[PDB]
Scaffold this active site. Structure first.
Site, PDB file in Angstrom:
ATOM      1  N   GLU A 201       0.804  -1.214   0.000  1.00 24.97           N
ATOM      2  CA  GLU A 201       0.000   0.000   0.000  1.00 24.97           C
ATOM      3  C   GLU A 201       0.825   1.246   0.000  1.00 24.97           C
ATOM      4  O   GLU A 201       2.055   1.152   0.147  1.00 24.97           O
ATOM      5  CB  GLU A 201      -0.922   0.029   1.191  1.00 24.97           C
ATOM      6  CG  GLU A 201      -0.281  -0.400   2.491  1.00 24.97           C
ATOM      7  CD  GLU A 201       1.034   0.313   2.817  1.00 24.97           C
ATOM      8  OE1 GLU A 201       1.019   1.506   3.040  1.00 24.97           O
ATOM      9  OE2 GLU A 201       2.119  -0.308   2.867  1.00 24.97           O
TER      10      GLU A 201
ATOM     11  N   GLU B  55       4.660  -0.098   0.879  1.00 27.67           N
ATOM     12  CA  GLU B  55       4.634  -0.172  -0.574  1.00 27.67           C
ATOM     13  C   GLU B  55       4.671  -1.583  -1.158  1.00 27.67           C
ATOM     14  O   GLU B  55       4.753  -1.709  -2.360  1.00 27.67           O
ATOM     15  CB  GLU B  55       5.823   0.521  -1.253  1.00 27.67           C
ATOM     16  CG  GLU B  55       6.262   1.777  -0.613  1.00 27.67           C
ATOM     17  CD  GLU B  55       7.249   2.504  -1.428  1.00 27.67           C
ATOM     18  OE1 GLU B  55       7.804   1.958  -2.399  1.00 27.67           O
ATOM     19  OE2 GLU B  55       7.507   3.619  -1.010  1.00 27.67           O
TER      20      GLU B  55
HETATM   21  O1  LIG Z   1       4.584  -1.443   6.085  1.00 29.09           O
HETATM   22  C1  LIG Z   1       5.011  -0.958   7.153  1.00 29.09           C
HETATM   23  O2  LIG Z   1       5.317  -1.690   8.116  1.00 29.09           O
HETATM   24  C2  LIG Z   1       5.028   0.534   7.378  1.00 29.09           C
HETATM   25  C3  LIG Z   1       5.267   1.020   8.670  1.00 29.09           C
HETATM   26  C4  LIG Z   1       5.272   2.398   8.854  1.00 29.09           C
HETATM   27  C5  LIG Z   1       4.961   3.254   7.808  1.00 29.09           C
HETATM   28  N1  LIG Z   1       4.704   2.734   6.594  1.00 29.09           N
HETATM   29  C6  LIG Z   1       4.465   3.631   5.440  1.00 29.09           C
HETATM   30  O3  LIG Z   1       4.401   5.024   5.791  1.00 29.09           O
HETATM   31  C7  LIG Z   1       3.052   5.283   5.604  1.00 29.09           C
HETATM   32  C8  LIG Z   1       2.158   5.557   6.779  1.00 29.09           C
HETATM   33  O4  LIG Z   1       2.738   6.113   7.980  1.00 29.09           O
HETATM   34  P1  LIG Z   1       1.826   7.192   8.754  1.00 29.09           P
HETATM   35  O5  LIG Z   1       2.748   7.625   9.852  1.00 29.09           O
HETATM   36  O6  LIG Z   1       1.374   8.196   7.782  1.00 29.09           O
HETATM   37  O7  LIG Z   1       0.621   6.379   9.310  1.00 29.09           O
HETATM   38  C9  LIG Z   1       2.470   4.671   4.372  1.00 29.09           C
HETATM   39  O8  LIG Z   1       2.307   5.167   3.071  1.00 29.09           O
HETATM   40  C10 LIG Z   1       3.263   3.395   4.527  1.00 29.09           C
HETATM   41  O9  LIG Z   1       3.094   2.217   3.722  1.00 29.09           O
HETATM   42  C11 LIG Z   1       4.717   1.427   6.369  1.00 29.09           C
HETATM   43  C1  LIG Z   2       7.850  10.209   2.308  1.00 33.36           C
HETATM   44  C2  LIG Z   2       7.431   8.813   1.907  1.00 33.36           C
HETATM   45  C3  LIG Z   2       6.380   8.129   2.535  1.00 33.36           C
HETATM   46  C4  LIG Z   2       6.051   6.832   2.090  1.00 33.36           C
HETATM   47  C5  LIG Z   2       6.782   6.263   1.043  1.00 33.36           C
HETATM   48  O1  LIG Z   2       6.484   5.014   0.581  1.00 33.36           O
HETATM   49  C6  LIG Z   2       7.794   6.935   0.415  1.00 33.36           C
HETATM   50  C7  LIG Z   2       8.113   8.219   0.857  1.00 33.36           C
END
Ligand SMILES: O=C(O)c1ccc[n+]([C@@H]2O[C@H](COP(=O)([O-])O)[C@@H](O)[C@H]2O)c1
Ligand SMILES: Cc1ccc(O)cc1
Ligand SMILES: O=C(O)c1ccc[n+]([C@@H]2O[C@H](COP(=O)([O-])O)[C@@H](O)[C@H]2O)c1
Ligand SMILES: Cc1ccc(O)cc1
Lengths: 347, 347
Positions: free
Chosen positions: A172, A315
């Site tokens: 995602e 992602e």
């Molecule tokens: O896949 C993970 O474990 C993961 C852990 C922390 C953050 N992320 C990525 O960072 C994003 C969301 O973080 P936030 O703090 O906006 O909730 C989002 O686009 C993600 O896929 C992803």
């Molecule tokens: C800043 C950012 C956040 C998520 C990501 O997948 C990449 C860049």
């Protein structure tokens, strides 16, 4: 219909799995010495869309992209537009998932299931709306919307099988999306929000308490029913979370494996398995997300990732990173010689 | 000379590592979100034989093969001839390491450093003798022998750099070899033999106690000096263990990375770092061996494997399995886009 989909997910093929097990025991190694490659090879053997044997043909990572109204509650560090920017970047091959998918020989499918921006050319459009409702004050979406998206995504996913895809990975992109993921984890596992709310994309420590309060408020106001996953998704999830769930349902319906990714994917997986327990044997973990609630979520799925990378990008990056592992299980299976042909007897 | 070799191992390049770190922080992800890929990419940057940047060219897994007199003490389940059989199998591509190396695009170098059989055509011959002495009653080998082998192997390894090898993996094959590995682990870490003696190649539970006694007896009779690794190797190690040590010294002298494998490789690594602390920054773990003493050995090296496969085959199989991970660190580094080019500011 979604009822038909769920009904028709196949059970794993015990016969193929027994045959796979006996083959593996006869390979040119001490029995059991390849450990989890063995168990993975047998798990694969049992997935009916692989035709009785561990194999990997083409590989696809499905990256579900959306925005969240709960962004407005101060739970994310990056501007809302980052979701749209990054989805556009996905079309240019410059992202973590793109790079890791290229390394694995996998194709990346970028799907917009609800970005709050103008549509992005070249991205697959399944947008439900311009971002989901703010789970702090009300539902993310209607049940109708969550059902429609699941069915849409499930069909897309299983269609990829006709083009020769035998292995999926889910991912995602969505600013703030670690908030609904935490809410869902809390609701499915009964863990208190403080145990499952992480720093997401580098949220500062001073802002954690607000995020925990926000998760608690979302659950208090929406009263998601933990024994109805679609209810949980629709109330305190997100379009991205629903989409990833839909990938898992579609792969399972097709009798084919899906690699999980990180924390977001775990929340979706909890929903998948609640909705349809028959999904579970098709799920393959990749890595152990650095996100706080990971351990709890993974324990509720009884899963132990292969990769301990301290990774928290999302992602579908981790899913991509593990595809070579799945491939190694198959290579082991198909390409090792046999004990018997060297006259080495079982001791 | 071995003194010159050890003296001339280069320190890691702090400048390249700082540059690598700043590049990585600017890539199109939250800073730190690729976790251990980042740290691995920076570790690589600092290895002088890679020329200032994370890169992988050609890949070689060096599989050190030998037999052990301590076989005669009842510590191994398989017949002694299995070592020779399997080394021959290595020349035909039918082994676990061969298959996993092929998947990784790595070449496998099968080196006979002391198999107790006729020489095997097509295997690289560095045989010290037909199996090492029985570490239960006396030394594995003379100090002269251990020194000569280290220097031989180190030179072979670093020569591979002229042919374009930038990444090594170490492995072994040798019936009974988990006994000296345990002895060495016990001696370097001061852990009691009962804590570090595993089942090796499926040794039955009823035979464990004998193996523990045998390790204790080998240490009592030989009095290896824990602060002299070459003494430890020569007294209660094996030709295979020495060889793998030699691979680590050669890679480090060349300024280049070596992937560890399993339990055997950990014991060799303990020796390497005792002999020359400057080896340590060149070592990269792969997987977490299912062998009992693994945790203790790995803790003494302060290492955390990337892969948790419950694997215990040896042969360099785990080292091979991890090469794609090293490659992913480089791809991340070289192929990701940058935050600045999407106008995403550090929050
Ligand atoms: O896949 C993970 O474990 C993961 C852990 C922390 C953050 N992320 C990525 O960072 C994003 C969301 O973080 P936030 O703090 O906006 O909730 C989002 O686009 C993600 O896929 C992803
Ligand atoms: C800043 C950012 C956040 C998520 C990501 O997948 C990449 C860049
Ligand atoms: O690398 C490992 O962790 C590993 C753990 C247990 C056994 N082995 C392999 O099995 C062998 C030795 O087991 P044994 O019981 O003879 O000491 C040898 O040829 C190995 O490389 C390897
Ligand atoms: C029996 C056996 C087979 C392979 C191997 O690497 C060790 C032992």
């Amino acid at each position: 219909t979604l009822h038909a989909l769920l009904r028709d997910i196949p059970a794993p093929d015990a016969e193929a799995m027994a045959r796979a097990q006996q083959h593996i025991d006869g390979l040119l190694k001490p029995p059991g010495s390849l450990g989890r490659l063995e168990t993975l090879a047998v798990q694969l053997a049992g997935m009916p869309g692989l035709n009785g044997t561990p194999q990997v043909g083409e590989k696809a990572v499905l990256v579900m992209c959306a925005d969240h109204g709960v962004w407005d509650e101060g739970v994310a560090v990056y501007p809302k537009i980052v979701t749209a920017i990054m989805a556009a970047n996905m079309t240019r091959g410059t992202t973590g998932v793109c790079v890791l998918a290229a390394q694995a020989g996998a194709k990346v499918h970028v799907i917009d299931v609800g970005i709050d921006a103008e549509p992005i050319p070249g991205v697959v459009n399944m947008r439900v709306a311009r971002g989901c409702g703010n789970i702090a004050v009300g539902p993310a979406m209607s049940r109708l919307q969550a059902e429609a998206l699941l069915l849409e995504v499930s069909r897309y996913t299983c269609d990829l099988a006709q083009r020769g895809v035998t292995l999926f990975g889910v991912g995602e992109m969505g600013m703030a999306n670690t908030t609904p993921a935490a809410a869902m984890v809390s609701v499915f596992t009964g863990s208190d929000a403080k145990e499952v709310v992480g720093i997401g994309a580098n949220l500062p420590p001073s802002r954690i308490d607000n995020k925990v309060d926000v998760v608690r408020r979302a659950i208090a106001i929406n009263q998601p029913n933990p024994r109805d996953g679609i209810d949980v998704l629709s109330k305190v999830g997100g379009f991205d979370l629903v989409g990833m769930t839909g990938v898992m349902l579609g792969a399972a319906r097709c009798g084919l494996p899906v690699l999980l990714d990180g924390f977001l994917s775990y929340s979706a997986a909890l929903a998948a398995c609640q909705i349809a327990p028959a999904v579970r044997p098709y799920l393959i973990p990749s890595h152990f997300s650095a996100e706080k609630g990971a351990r709890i979520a993974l324990a509720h799925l009884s899963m132990e990732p292969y990769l301990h990378m301290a990774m928290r990008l999302g992602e579908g990056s981790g899913a991509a990173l593990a595809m070579p592992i799945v491939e190694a299980a198959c290579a082991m299976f198909h390409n090792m010689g046999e004990l018997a042909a060297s006259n080495i007897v079982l001791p």
